[PDB]
Amino acid sequence: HISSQQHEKAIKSYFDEAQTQGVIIIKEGKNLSTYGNALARANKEYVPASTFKMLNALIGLENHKATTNEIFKWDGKKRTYPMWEKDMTLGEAMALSADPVYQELARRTGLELMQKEVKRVNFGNTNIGTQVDNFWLVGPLKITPVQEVNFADDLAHNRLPFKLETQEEVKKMLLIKEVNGSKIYAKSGWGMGVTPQVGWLTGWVEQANGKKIPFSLNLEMKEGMSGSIRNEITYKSLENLGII
């Protein structure tokens, strides 16, 4: 079998080769493992960016601000990315990380219920400030990679304080890959406002035999970089560890 010195070296190298700094936390049962080329990022706070869509969806659905088949219409105004200029369900908006749809959901939820719910779930530092529609991009909401992997663990196991059905509905939105009888569920994130910029991929592997292994990748994104680096580093890491 492969030494842990070798696993640690290989996974550090994936971050080194992307010329970034980052950490990937893996949780097996109750045990947290930190890998990568910048381990001390593990308990530093960063903005959640689009990772917050997972919780935005849980809250909106739990509180009847939307259903999973409702179509959010594009209002016809130019959006940052052309793929966002279409009508979509929460689930399609989740896959495209369409922030305008999630901003609409946050506004339906409203600042007051959003604050209560985020406090109730104990997400990150739990502060959302005064603007219901932008608190996940440039503050004041922050969260550590450890807190992200613990949130994933909670969602993967239906332990968050929302109906089981709400959790299943949001989980069905998060399937991003199947790989040898393993399913990967995750939400990506790219905070382009903050400096430096933060990249996330937080989720879990559901293995053939039913076991769920949560992970959170957290790295620095730079002007040169492609978004799929987050996926590539993650898949390479989970494979190196034989998780997938």
Side-chain angles (χ1 to χ4, degrees), residues 1-16 18-77 79-115 117-164 166-171 173-221 224-244:
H1 236 336
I2 293 182
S3 64
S4 78
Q5 169 188 79
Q6 152 131 121
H7 284 312
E8 292 167 22
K9 179 182 182 200
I11 298 159
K12 170 178 180 292
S13 72
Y14 305 144
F15 291 86
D16 286 335
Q19 260 128 334
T20 180
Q21 298 106 56
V23 65
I24 183 169
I25 333 275
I26 311 280
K27 191 175 186 180
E28 273 150 325
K30 287 176 145 181
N31 189 39
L32 289 173
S33 296
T34 305
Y35 297 97
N37 68 359
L39 296 194
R41 304 174 67 91
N43 293 283
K44 290 198 178 310
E45 283 189 334
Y46 303 90
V47 300
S50 290
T51 62
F52 186 68
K53 300 189 183 359
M54 285 181 293
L55 180 49
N56 191 349
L58 289 161
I59 292 174
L61 287 175
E62 185 88 357
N63 295 292
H64 304 100
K65 309 300 164 175
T67 56
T68 60
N69 34 49
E70 166 175 5
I71 295 163
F72 290 69
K73 308 276 193 204
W74 171 46
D75 58 0
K77 297 210 192 312
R79 280 182 181 189
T80 316
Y81 309 96
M83 42 160 79
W84 291 350
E85 289 169 353
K86 92 165 196 80
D87 306 330
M88 67 197 107
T89 68
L90 284 184
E92 290 156 353
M94 187 78 72
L96 300 183
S97 210
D99 201 58
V101 169
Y102 273 91
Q103 280 183 296
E104 168 62 8
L105 190 65
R107 295 171 182 123
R108 301 183 180 182
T109 285
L111 186 73
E112 180 178 312
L113 169 61
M114 188 65 90
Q115 194 48 101
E117 286 292 83
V118 164
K119 265 275 195 318
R120 192 172 56 89
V121 162
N122 186 206
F123 183 88
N125 70 0
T126 87
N127 191 27
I128 77 168
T130 54
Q131 288 177 29
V132 76
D133 61 30
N134 97 339
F135 65 78
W136 53 84
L137 271 182
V138 277
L141 181 68
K142 311 248 187 90
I143 187 163
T144 70
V146 165
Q147 280 168 337
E148 284 243 343
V149 70
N150 289 330
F151 173 85
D153 188 35
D154 281 348
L155 180 55
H157 295 93
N158 305 315
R159 301 189 208 117
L160 293 166
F162 290 107
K163 301 180 236 207
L164 163 61
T166 311
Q167 293 174 86
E168 296 289 351
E169 282 174 336
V170 175
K171 293 194 262 171
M173 304 175 184
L174 294 173
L175 179 57
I176 60 166
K177 178 98 172 196
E178 297 174 58
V179 173
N180 311 121
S182 275
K183 297 165 218 263
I184 308 165
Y185 291 87
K187 187 63 199 78
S188 64
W190 190 341
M192 285 168 192
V194 277
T195 320
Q197 292 176 19
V198 61
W200 290 103
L201 185 64
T202 298
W204 64 93
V205 177
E206 180 194 309
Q207 293 181 307
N209 43 87
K211 264 225 314 150
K212 291 141 167 175
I213 304 165
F215 63 82
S216 185
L217 177 122
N218 172 286
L219 54 60
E220 189 178 282
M221 302 292 281
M225 313 199 188
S226 156
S228 68
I229 212 44
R230 293 162 307 176
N231 307 73
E232 283 164 39
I233 295 172
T234 296
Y235 304 160
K236 283 209 268 165
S237 300
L238 297 165
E239 184 183 60
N240 178 274
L241 283 166
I243 293 170
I244 63 189

Short mmCIF file of all heavy atoms in Angstrom, two decimals, residues 65-67 69-74 79 86-90 100-102 104-105 108:
data_model
loop_
_atom_site.label_atom_id
_atom_site.label_comp_id
_atom_site.label_asym_id
_atom_site.label_seq_id
_atom_site.Cartn_x
_atom_site.Cartn_y
_atom_site.Cartn_z
N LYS A 65 -40.75 29.58 -0.48
CA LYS A 65 -40.50 30.69 -1.39
C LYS A 65 -40.35 30.19 -2.83
O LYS A 65 -40.12 31.01 -3.71
CB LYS A 65 -39.25 31.49 -0.99
CG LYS A 65 -39.25 31.93 0.47
CD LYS A 65 -40.43 32.81 0.78
CE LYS A 65 -40.65 32.93 2.27
NZ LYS A 65 -41.75 33.89 2.48
N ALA A 66 -40.40 28.87 -3.06
CA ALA A 66 -40.20 28.42 -4.43
C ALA A 66 -40.52 26.94 -4.42
O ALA A 66 -40.59 26.39 -3.35
CB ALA A 66 -38.75 28.64 -4.89
N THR A 67 -40.71 26.33 -5.58
CA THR A 67 -40.81 24.87 -5.60
C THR A 67 -39.72 24.40 -6.55
O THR A 67 -39.12 25.24 -7.20
CB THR A 67 -42.14 24.42 -6.23
OG1 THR A 67 -42.18 25.02 -7.52
CG2 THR A 67 -43.36 24.87 -5.43
N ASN A 69 -39.98 22.92 -9.29
CA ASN A 69 -40.22 22.94 -10.73
C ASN A 69 -40.56 24.34 -11.23
O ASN A 69 -40.70 24.55 -12.44
CB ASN A 69 -41.24 21.91 -11.23
CG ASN A 69 -42.31 21.69 -10.20
OD1 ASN A 69 -42.89 22.67 -9.68
ND2 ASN A 69 -42.50 20.43 -9.85
N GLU A 70 -40.66 25.29 -10.31
CA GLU A 70 -40.99 26.65 -10.71
C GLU A 70 -39.89 27.19 -11.66
O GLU A 70 -38.68 26.99 -11.45
CB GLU A 70 -41.04 27.52 -9.46
CG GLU A 70 -41.05 29.00 -9.75
CD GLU A 70 -41.22 29.86 -8.51
OE1 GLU A 70 -41.23 29.33 -7.42
OE2 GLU A 70 -41.29 31.07 -8.65
N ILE A 71 -40.29 27.91 -12.71
CA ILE A 71 -39.32 28.42 -13.66
C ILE A 71 -39.09 29.89 -13.33
O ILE A 71 -40.04 30.65 -13.30
CB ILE A 71 -39.83 28.17 -15.10
CG1 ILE A 71 -39.89 26.66 -15.36
CG2 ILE A 71 -38.96 28.90 -16.13
CD1 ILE A 71 -40.72 26.29 -16.55
N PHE A 72 -37.85 30.26 -12.98
CA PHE A 72 -37.50 31.67 -12.78
C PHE A 72 -37.14 32.26 -14.15
O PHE A 72 -36.16 31.84 -14.78
CB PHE A 72 -36.28 31.75 -11.83
CG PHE A 72 -36.58 31.35 -10.41
CD1 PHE A 72 -36.89 30.03 -10.08
CD2 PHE A 72 -36.64 32.32 -9.40
CE1 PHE A 72 -37.18 29.68 -8.77
CE2 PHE A 72 -36.98 31.98 -8.10
CZ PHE A 72 -37.25 30.65 -7.79
N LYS A 73 -37.94 33.24 -14.63
CA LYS A 73 -37.79 33.76 -15.97
C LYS A 73 -36.64 34.75 -15.98
O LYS A 73 -36.53 35.57 -15.10
CB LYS A 73 -39.01 34.59 -16.41
CG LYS A 73 -40.35 33.90 -16.24
CD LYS A 73 -40.77 32.97 -17.36
CE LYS A 73 -42.25 32.63 -17.20
NZ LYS A 73 -42.62 31.35 -17.85
N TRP A 74 -35.83 34.72 -17.03
CA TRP A 74 -34.89 35.79 -17.27
C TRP A 74 -35.69 37.06 -17.56
O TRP A 74 -36.62 37.03 -18.38
CB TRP A 74 -34.06 35.35 -18.47
CG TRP A 74 -33.16 36.40 -19.01
CD1 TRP A 74 -32.35 37.22 -18.29
CD2 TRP A 74 -32.98 36.76 -20.39
NE1 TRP A 74 -31.66 38.06 -19.13
CE2 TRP A 74 -31.99 37.77 -20.43
CE3 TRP A 74 -33.53 36.31 -21.60
CZ2 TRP A 74 -31.56 38.36 -21.62
CZ3 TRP A 74 -33.11 36.89 -22.78
CH2 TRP A 74 -32.13 37.90 -22.79
N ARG A 79 -26.83 39.79 -18.54
CA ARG A 79 -26.32 39.17 -17.31
C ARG A 79 -24.83 38.92 -17.56
O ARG A 79 -24.43 38.82 -18.72
CB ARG A 79 -27.09 37.86 -17.01
CG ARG A 79 -28.47 37.99 -16.35
CD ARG A 79 -29.16 36.65 -16.02
NE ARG A 79 -30.50 36.62 -15.40
CZ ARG A 79 -31.11 35.52 -14.93
NH1 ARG A 79 -30.47 34.37 -14.99
NH2 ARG A 79 -32.32 35.57 -14.38
N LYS A 86 -31.42 32.92 -19.57
CA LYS A 86 -32.45 31.94 -19.89
C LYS A 86 -33.31 31.72 -18.65
O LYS A 86 -32.94 32.15 -17.56
CB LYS A 86 -31.85 30.60 -20.33
CG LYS A 86 -31.60 29.56 -19.23
CD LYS A 86 -31.36 28.15 -19.78
CE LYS A 86 -31.48 26.99 -18.80
NZ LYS A 86 -32.88 26.56 -18.52
N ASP A 87 -34.48 31.11 -18.84
CA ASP A 87 -35.42 30.76 -17.79
C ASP A 87 -34.95 29.45 -17.16
O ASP A 87 -34.49 28.56 -17.87
CB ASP A 87 -36.80 30.53 -18.41
CG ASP A 87 -37.27 31.72 -19.27
OD1 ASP A 87 -36.89 32.89 -18.97
OD2 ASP A 87 -38.05 31.50 -20.20
N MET A 88 -35.02 29.34 -15.83
CA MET A 88 -34.48 28.14 -15.21
C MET A 88 -35.11 27.85 -13.84
O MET A 88 -35.58 28.78 -13.15
CB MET A 88 -32.94 28.13 -15.19
CG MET A 88 -32.28 29.16 -14.33
SD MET A 88 -30.47 29.36 -14.78
CE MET A 88 -30.37 30.94 -15.63
N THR A 89 -35.12 26.55 -13.51
CA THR A 89 -35.48 26.07 -12.18
C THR A 89 -34.32 26.32 -11.21
O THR A 89 -33.24 26.67 -11.65
CB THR A 89 -35.78 24.58 -12.24
OG1 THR A 89 -34.55 23.90 -12.52
CG2 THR A 89 -36.86 24.26 -13.26
N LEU A 90 -34.56 26.19 -9.91
CA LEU A 90 -33.51 26.35 -8.90
C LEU A 90 -32.40 25.36 -9.21
O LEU A 90 -31.24 25.67 -9.01
CB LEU A 90 -34.08 26.04 -7.51
CG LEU A 90 -34.95 27.14 -6.90
CD1 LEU A 90 -35.37 26.78 -5.48
CD2 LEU A 90 -34.16 28.44 -6.88
N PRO A 100 -28.25 35.46 -10.36
CA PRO A 100 -29.50 36.22 -10.40
C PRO A 100 -30.73 35.46 -9.90
O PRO A 100 -31.60 36.03 -9.24
CB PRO A 100 -29.63 36.56 -11.90
CG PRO A 100 -28.15 36.61 -12.37
CD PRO A 100 -27.57 35.39 -11.68
N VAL A 101 -30.76 34.15 -10.13
CA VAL A 101 -31.91 33.38 -9.65
C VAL A 101 -31.83 33.29 -8.13
O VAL A 101 -32.86 33.36 -7.45
CB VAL A 101 -31.91 31.99 -10.29
CG1 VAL A 101 -32.91 31.06 -9.62
CG2 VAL A 101 -32.15 32.11 -11.79
N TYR A 102 -30.60 33.18 -7.61
CA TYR A 102 -30.45 32.93 -6.19
C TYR A 102 -30.67 34.25 -5.46
O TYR A 102 -31.08 34.27 -4.30
CB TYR A 102 -29.16 32.11 -5.88
CG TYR A 102 -29.49 30.65 -6.00
CD1 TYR A 102 -29.32 30.01 -7.22
CD2 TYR A 102 -30.08 29.94 -4.95
CE1 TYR A 102 -29.68 28.68 -7.35
CE2 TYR A 102 -30.43 28.61 -5.08
CZ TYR A 102 -30.27 27.98 -6.32
OH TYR A 102 -30.62 26.67 -6.56
N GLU A 104 -32.87 36.37 -6.48
CA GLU A 104 -34.33 36.48 -6.45
C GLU A 104 -34.84 35.68 -5.26
O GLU A 104 -35.64 36.18 -4.50
CB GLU A 104 -34.98 36.02 -7.77
CG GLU A 104 -36.51 35.85 -7.71
CD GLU A 104 -37.42 37.06 -7.41
OE1 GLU A 104 -36.91 38.26 -7.37
OE2 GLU A 104 -38.65 36.82 -7.12
N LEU A 105 -34.36 34.44 -5.10
CA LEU A 105 -34.79 33.61 -3.99
C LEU A 105 -34.48 34.30 -2.65
O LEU A 105 -35.31 34.27 -1.74
CB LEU A 105 -34.12 32.23 -4.11
CG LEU A 105 -34.67 31.17 -3.15
CD1 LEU A 105 -36.13 30.85 -3.45
CD2 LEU A 105 -33.81 29.92 -3.13
N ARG A 108 -36.95 36.88 -1.98
CA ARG A 108 -38.25 36.39 -1.55
C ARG A 108 -38.16 36.01 -0.07
O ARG A 108 -39.08 36.22 0.72
CB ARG A 108 -38.68 35.18 -2.40
CG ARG A 108 -38.77 35.43 -3.90
CD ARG A 108 -39.28 34.14 -4.54
NE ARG A 108 -39.39 34.30 -5.98
CZ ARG A 108 -39.85 33.36 -6.82
NH1 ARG A 108 -40.22 32.17 -6.36
NH2 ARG A 108 -39.95 33.65 -8.10
#
